[PDB]
Short mmCIF file of C-alpha atoms in Angstrom, two decimals:
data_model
loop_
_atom_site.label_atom_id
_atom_site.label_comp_id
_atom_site.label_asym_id
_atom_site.label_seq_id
_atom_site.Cartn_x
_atom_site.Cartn_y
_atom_site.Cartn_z
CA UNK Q 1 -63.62 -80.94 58.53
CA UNK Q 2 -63.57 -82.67 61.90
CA UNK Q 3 -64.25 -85.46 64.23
CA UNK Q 4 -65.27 -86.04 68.04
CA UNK Q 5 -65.51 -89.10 69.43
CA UNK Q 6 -66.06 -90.30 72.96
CA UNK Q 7 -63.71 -93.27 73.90
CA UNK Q 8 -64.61 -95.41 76.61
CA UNK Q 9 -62.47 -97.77 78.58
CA UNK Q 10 -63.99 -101.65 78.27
CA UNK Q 11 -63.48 -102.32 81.86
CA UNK Q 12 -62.88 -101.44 85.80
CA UNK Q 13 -59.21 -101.28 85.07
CA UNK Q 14 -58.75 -99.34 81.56
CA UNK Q 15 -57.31 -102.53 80.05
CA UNK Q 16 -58.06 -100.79 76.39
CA UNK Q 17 -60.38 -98.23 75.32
CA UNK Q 18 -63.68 -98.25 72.92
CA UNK Q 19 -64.79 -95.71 70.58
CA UNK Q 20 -67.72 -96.31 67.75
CA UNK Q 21 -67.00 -96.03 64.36
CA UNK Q 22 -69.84 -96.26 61.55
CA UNK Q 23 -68.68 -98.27 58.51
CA UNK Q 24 -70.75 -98.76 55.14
CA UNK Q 25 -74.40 -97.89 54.52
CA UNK Q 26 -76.38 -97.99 56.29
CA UNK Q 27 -74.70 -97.74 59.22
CA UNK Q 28 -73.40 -100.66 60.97
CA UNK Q 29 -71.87 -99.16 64.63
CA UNK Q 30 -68.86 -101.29 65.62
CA UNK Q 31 -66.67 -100.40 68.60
CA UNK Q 32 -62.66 -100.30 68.06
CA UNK Q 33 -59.92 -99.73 69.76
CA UNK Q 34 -57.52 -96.89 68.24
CA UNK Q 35 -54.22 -98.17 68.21
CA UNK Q 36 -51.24 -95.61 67.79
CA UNK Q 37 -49.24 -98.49 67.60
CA UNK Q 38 -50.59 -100.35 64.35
CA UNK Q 39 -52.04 -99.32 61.30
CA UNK Q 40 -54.58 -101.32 60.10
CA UNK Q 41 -58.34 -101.09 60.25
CA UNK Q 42 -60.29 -104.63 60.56
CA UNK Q 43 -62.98 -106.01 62.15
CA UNK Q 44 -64.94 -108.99 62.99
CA UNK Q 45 -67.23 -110.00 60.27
CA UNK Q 46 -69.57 -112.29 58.64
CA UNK Q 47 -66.45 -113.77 57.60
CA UNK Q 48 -64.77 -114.26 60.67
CA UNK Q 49 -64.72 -118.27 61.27
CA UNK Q 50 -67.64 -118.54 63.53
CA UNK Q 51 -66.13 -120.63 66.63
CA UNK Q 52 -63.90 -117.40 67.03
CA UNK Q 53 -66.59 -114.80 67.25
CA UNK Q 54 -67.92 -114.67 71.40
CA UNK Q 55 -70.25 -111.56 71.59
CA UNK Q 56 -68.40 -109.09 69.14
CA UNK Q 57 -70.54 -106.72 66.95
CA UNK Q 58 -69.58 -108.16 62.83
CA UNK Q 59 -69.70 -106.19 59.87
CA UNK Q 60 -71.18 -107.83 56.77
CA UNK Q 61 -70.04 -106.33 54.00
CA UNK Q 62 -73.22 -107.53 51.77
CA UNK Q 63 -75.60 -105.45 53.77
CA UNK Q 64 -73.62 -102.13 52.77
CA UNK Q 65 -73.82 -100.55 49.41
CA UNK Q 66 -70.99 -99.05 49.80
CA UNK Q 67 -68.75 -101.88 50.16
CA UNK Q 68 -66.38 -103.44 47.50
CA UNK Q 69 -63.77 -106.50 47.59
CA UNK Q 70 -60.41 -104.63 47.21
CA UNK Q 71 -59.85 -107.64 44.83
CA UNK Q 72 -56.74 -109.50 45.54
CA UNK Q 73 -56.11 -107.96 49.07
CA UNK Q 74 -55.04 -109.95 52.13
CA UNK Q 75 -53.52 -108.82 55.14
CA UNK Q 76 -52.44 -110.38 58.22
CA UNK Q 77 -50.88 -109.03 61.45
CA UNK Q 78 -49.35 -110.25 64.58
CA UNK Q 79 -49.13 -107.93 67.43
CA UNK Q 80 -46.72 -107.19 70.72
CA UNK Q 81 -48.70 -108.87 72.71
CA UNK Q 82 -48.23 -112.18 70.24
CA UNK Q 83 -52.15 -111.51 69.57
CA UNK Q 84 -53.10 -112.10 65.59
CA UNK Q 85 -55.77 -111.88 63.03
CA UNK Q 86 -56.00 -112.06 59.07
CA UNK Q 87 -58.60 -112.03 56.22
CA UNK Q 88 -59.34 -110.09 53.10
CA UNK Q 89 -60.16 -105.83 52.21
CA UNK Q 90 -63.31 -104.29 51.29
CA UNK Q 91 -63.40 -100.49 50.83
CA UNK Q 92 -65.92 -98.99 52.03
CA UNK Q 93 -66.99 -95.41 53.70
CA UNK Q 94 -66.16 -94.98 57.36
CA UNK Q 95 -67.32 -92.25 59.83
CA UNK Q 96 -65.47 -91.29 63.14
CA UNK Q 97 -67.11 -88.71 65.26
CA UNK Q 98 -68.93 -86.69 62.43
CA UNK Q 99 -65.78 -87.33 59.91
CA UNK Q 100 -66.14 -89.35 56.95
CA UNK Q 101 -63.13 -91.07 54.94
CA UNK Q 102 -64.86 -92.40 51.39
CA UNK Q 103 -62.93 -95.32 50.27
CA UNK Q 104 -60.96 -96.82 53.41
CA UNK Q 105 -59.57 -100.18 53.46
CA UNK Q 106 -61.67 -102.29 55.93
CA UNK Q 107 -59.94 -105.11 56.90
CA UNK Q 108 -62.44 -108.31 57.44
CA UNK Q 109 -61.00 -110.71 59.85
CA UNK Q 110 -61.62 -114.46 58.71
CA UNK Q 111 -59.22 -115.46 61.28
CA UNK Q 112 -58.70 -113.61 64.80
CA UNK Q 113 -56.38 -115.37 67.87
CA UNK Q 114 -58.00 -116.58 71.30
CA UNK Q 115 -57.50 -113.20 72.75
CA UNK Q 116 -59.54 -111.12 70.72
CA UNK Q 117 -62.11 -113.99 70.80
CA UNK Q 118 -62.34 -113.58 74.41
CA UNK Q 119 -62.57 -110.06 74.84
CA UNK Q 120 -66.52 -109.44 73.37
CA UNK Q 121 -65.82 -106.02 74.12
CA UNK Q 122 -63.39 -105.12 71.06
CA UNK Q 123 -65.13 -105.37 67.62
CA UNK Q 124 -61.76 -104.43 65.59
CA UNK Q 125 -58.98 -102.43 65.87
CA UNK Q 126 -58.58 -98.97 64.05
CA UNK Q 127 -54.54 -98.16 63.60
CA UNK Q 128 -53.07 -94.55 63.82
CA UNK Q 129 -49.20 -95.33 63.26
CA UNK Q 130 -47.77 -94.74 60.20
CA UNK Q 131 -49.46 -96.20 56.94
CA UNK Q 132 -45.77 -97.97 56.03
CA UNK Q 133 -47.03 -100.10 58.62
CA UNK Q 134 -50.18 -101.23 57.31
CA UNK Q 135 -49.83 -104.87 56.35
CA UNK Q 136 -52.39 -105.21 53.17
CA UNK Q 137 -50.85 -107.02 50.32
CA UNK Q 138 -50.03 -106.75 47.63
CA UNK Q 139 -50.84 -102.95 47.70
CA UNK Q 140 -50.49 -101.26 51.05
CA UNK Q 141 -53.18 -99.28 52.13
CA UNK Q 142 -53.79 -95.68 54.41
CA UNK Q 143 -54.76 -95.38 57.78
CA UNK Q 144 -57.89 -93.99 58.69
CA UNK Q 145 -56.17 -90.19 59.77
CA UNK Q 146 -53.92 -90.75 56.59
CA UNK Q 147 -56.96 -90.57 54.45
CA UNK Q 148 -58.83 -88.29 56.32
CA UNK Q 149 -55.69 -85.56 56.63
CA UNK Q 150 -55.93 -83.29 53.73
CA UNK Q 151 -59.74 -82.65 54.20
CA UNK Q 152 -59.16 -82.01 58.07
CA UNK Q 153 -59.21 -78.44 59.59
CA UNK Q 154 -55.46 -78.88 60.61
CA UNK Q 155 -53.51 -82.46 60.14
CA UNK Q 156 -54.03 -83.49 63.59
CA UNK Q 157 -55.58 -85.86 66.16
CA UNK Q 158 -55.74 -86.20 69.77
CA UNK Q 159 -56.11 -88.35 72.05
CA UNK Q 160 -57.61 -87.76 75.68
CA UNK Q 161 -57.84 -90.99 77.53
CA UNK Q 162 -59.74 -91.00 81.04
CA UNK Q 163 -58.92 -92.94 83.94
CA UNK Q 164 -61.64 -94.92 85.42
CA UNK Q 165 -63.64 -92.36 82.68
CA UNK Q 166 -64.65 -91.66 79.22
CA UNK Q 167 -62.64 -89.78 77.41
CA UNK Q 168 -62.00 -87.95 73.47
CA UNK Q 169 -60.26 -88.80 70.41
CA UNK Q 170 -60.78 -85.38 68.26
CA UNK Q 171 -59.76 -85.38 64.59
CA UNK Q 172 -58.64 -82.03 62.72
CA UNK Q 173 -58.59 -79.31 65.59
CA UNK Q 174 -57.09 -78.76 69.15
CA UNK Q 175 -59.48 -78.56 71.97
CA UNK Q 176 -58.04 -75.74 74.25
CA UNK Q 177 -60.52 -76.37 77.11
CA UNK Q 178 -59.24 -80.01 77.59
CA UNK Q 179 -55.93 -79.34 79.36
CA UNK Q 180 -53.75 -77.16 81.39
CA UNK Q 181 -51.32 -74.93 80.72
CA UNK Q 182 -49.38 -75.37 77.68
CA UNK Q 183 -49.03 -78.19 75.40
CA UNK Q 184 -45.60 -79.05 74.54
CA UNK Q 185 -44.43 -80.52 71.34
CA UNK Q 186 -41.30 -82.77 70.92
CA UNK Q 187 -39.73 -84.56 67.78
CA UNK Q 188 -41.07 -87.46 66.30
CA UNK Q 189 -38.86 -90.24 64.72
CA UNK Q 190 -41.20 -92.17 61.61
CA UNK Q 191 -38.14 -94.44 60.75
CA UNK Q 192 -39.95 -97.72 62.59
CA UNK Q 193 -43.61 -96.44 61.50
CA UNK Q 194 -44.88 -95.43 65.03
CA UNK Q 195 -44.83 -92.07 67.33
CA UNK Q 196 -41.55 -92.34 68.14
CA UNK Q 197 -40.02 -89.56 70.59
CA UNK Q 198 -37.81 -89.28 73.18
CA UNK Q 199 -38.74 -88.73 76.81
CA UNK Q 200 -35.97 -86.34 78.59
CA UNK Q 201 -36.10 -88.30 81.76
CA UNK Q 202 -38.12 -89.77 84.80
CA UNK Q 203 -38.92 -89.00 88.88
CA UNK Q 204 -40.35 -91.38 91.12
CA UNK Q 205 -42.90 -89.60 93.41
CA UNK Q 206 -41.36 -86.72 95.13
CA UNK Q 207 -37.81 -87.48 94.14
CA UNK Q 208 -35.14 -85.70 92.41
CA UNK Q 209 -35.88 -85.44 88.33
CA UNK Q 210 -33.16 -87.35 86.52
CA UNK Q 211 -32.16 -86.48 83.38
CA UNK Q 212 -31.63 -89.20 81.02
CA UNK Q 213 -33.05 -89.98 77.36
CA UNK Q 214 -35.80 -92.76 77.07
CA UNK Q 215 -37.03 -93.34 73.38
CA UNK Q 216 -40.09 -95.17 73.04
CA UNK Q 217 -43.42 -94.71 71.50
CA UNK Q 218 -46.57 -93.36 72.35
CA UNK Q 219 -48.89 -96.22 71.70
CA UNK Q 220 -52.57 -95.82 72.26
CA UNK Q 221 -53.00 -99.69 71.88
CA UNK Q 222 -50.93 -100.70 74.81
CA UNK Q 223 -52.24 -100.58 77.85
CA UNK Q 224 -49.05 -100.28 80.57
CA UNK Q 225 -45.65 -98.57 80.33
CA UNK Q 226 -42.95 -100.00 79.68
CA UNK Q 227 -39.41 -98.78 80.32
CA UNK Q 228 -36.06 -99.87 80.95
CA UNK Q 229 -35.27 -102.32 83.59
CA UNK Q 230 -33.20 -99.46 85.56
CA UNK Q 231 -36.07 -96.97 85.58
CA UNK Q 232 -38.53 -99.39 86.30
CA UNK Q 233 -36.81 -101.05 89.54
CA UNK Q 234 -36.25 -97.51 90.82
CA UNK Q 235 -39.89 -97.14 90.45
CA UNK Q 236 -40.70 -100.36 92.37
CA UNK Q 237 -38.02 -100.56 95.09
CA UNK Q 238 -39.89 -97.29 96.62
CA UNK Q 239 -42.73 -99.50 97.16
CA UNK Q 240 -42.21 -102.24 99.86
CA UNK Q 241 -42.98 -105.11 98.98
CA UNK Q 242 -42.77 -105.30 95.08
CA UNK Q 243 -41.12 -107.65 93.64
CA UNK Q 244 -40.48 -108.73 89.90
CA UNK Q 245 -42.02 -112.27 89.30
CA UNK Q 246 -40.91 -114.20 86.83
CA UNK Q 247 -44.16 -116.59 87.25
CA UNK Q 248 -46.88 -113.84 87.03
CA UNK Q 249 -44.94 -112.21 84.17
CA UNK Q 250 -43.90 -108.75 85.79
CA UNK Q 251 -43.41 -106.50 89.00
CA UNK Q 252 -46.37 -107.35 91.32
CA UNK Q 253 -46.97 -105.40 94.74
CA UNK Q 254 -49.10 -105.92 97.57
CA UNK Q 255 -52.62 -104.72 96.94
CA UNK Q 256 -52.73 -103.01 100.08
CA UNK Q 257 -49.61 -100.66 99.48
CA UNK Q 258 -49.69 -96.86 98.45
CA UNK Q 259 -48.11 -96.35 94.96
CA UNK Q 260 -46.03 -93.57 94.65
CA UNK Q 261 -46.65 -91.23 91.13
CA UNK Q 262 -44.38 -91.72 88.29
CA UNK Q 263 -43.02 -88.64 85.91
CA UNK Q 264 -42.02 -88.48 82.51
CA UNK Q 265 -40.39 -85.56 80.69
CA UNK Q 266 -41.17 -83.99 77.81
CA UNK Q 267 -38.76 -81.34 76.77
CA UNK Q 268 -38.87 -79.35 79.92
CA UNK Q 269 -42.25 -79.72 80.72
CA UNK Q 270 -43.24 -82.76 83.30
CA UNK Q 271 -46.50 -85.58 83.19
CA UNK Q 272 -46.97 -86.74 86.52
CA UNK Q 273 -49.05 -90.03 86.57
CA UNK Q 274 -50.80 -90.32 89.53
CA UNK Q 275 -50.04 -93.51 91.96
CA UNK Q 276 -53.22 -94.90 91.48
CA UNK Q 277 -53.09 -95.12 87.63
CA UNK Q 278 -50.49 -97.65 87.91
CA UNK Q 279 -52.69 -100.09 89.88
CA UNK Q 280 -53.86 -102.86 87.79
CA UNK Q 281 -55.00 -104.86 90.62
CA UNK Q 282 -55.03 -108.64 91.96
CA UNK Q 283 -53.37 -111.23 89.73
CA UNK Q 284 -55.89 -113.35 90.56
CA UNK Q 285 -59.44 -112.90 91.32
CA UNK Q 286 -59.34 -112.55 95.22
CA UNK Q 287 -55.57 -112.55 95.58
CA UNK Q 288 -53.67 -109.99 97.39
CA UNK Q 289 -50.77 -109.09 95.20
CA UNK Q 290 -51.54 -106.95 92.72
CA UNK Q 291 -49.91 -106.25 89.01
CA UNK Q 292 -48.16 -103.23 88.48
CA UNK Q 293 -48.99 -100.71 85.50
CA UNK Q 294 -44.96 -100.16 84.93
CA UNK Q 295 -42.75 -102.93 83.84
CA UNK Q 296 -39.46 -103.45 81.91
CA UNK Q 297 -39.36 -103.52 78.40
CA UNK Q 298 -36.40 -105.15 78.36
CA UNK Q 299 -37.68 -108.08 76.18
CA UNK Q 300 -39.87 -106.05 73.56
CA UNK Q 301 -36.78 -103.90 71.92
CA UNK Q 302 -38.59 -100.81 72.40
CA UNK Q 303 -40.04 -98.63 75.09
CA UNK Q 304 -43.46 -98.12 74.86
CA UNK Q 305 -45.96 -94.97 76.43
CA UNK Q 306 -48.82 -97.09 76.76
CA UNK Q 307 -52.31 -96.17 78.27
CA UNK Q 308 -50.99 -95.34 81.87
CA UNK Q 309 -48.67 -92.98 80.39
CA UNK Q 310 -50.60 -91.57 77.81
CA UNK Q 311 -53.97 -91.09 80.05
CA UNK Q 312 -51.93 -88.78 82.37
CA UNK Q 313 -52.17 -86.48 79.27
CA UNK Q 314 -53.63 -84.70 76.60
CA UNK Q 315 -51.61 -85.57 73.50
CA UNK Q 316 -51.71 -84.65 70.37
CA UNK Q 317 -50.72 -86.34 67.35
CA UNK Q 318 -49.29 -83.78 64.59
CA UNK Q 319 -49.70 -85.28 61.37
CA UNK Q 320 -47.72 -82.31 59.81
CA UNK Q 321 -45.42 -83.18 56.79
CA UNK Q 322 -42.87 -83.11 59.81
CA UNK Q 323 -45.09 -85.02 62.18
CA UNK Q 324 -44.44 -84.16 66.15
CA UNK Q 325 -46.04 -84.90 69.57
CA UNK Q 326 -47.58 -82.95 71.98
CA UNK Q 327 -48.60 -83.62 75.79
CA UNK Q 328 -50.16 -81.01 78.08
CA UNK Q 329 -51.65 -81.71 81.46
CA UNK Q 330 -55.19 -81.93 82.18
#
């Protein structure tokens, strides 16, 4: 089997990315962002506390036949981002694209934090790390892919994220009309539960290449990237006027500058992401400084190939008993 689904960015600045997924029967259509970083499926629901549901699209597990209380089951998650949500597990079926998983743990959010309140946009999240991170207890449950794996055409998934654009998540099969060139595949690290590699170095516009070894993950639920503090102030001293601000929380530049691109190794091949992908724009509705779509990671513990990275590329995630990553143009 596969899947195709169109994934849609949920505003003017590709702050995350929407793709429909059908749970339970009949139907109910909720929109979710697939997160490479997490591994957990939930969604608001008839049982989300009702002060903390703004606009989002709920599941109600009582209006689907298929549904059933994973009796006992809680979960309860806390993101990078120090975003958070718990509740209880029903299993029910779940479609993405055409594919069907019978049986997949839907999370049902009773309690969600202020920023998924806010954003009426995202209806749930749908994880793609590594099931060891899935945080049901007291029985751990699979990921969406995880379940889906043995029936698809070949253990994969991709991911091609537009910018300023729709774009594809594909399930079981490589599309070979949706990049350039070759695709090139690189190790992949499971120890911490995500899509762990290791970048072979950087350039900053036209400049030299430097070699050096970046780990970090590729993390489809992040929307920036985020390096070390060396990489990323060679990135913004080439662009006058950027500065890190403590206040604002990161390197901010003046809207009206040029951004030079920004490229990441992968083996020997090079993704160049374009200048303007790493314009996030004013801090402030109406102000002139701008916030910048690379910024340290030096106080999450991990680098992270977030949207702006990831966008620049077609990547697919080999689900293979030894799982790799691969990035090709586009």
């Amino acid at each position: 089997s596969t899947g195709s689904a169109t994934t849609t960015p949920i505003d003017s600045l590709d702050d995350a990315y929407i793709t429909p997924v059908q749970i339970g029967t009949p139907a109910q259509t909720l929109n979710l962002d697939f997160d490479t970083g997490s591994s957990d499926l939930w969604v608001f629901s008839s049982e989300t506390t009702a002060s903390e549901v703004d606009g989002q699209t709920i599941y109600t597990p009582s209006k689907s036949t298929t549904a059933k209380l994973l009796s006992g089951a809680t979960w309860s998650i806390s993101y990078g981002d120090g975003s958070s949500s718990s509740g209880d597990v029903y299993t029910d079926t779940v479609s993405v694209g055409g594919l069907t998983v019978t049986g997949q743990a839907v999370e049902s959010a009773k309690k969600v934090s202020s920023s998924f309140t806010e954003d009426s946009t995202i209806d749930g999240l749908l994880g793609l790390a590594f099931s060891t991170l899935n945080t049901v207890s007291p029985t751990q449950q699979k990921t969406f892919f995880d379940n889906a794996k043995a029936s698809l055409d070949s253990p994969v998934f991709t991911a091609d994220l537009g910018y300023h654009a729709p774009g594809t998540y594909n399930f079981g099969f490589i599309d070979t009309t949706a990049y350039t060139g070759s695709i090139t595949y690189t190790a992949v690290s499971t120890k911490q539960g995500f899509w762990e590699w290791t970048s072979t170095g950087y350039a900053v516009g036209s400049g030299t290449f430097k070699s050096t070894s970046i780990d970090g993950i590729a993390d489809t639920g992040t929307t920036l990237l985020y390096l070390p503090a060396t990489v990323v102030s060679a990135y913004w001293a080439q662009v006058s006027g950027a500065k890190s601000s403590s206040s604002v929380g990161g390197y901010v530049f003046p809207c009206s500058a040029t951004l030079p691109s920004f490229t990441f190794g992968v083996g020997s091949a090079r993704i160049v992401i374009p200048g303007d992908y790493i314009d996030f724009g004013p801090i402030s509705t109406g102000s002139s400084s701008c916030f910048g779509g690379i910024q340290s990671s030096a106080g999450i513990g991990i680098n992270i190939f977030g949207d702006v990275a990831l966008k620049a590329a077609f990547v697919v995630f080999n689900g293979a008993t030894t799982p790799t990553l691969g990035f090709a143009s586009k």
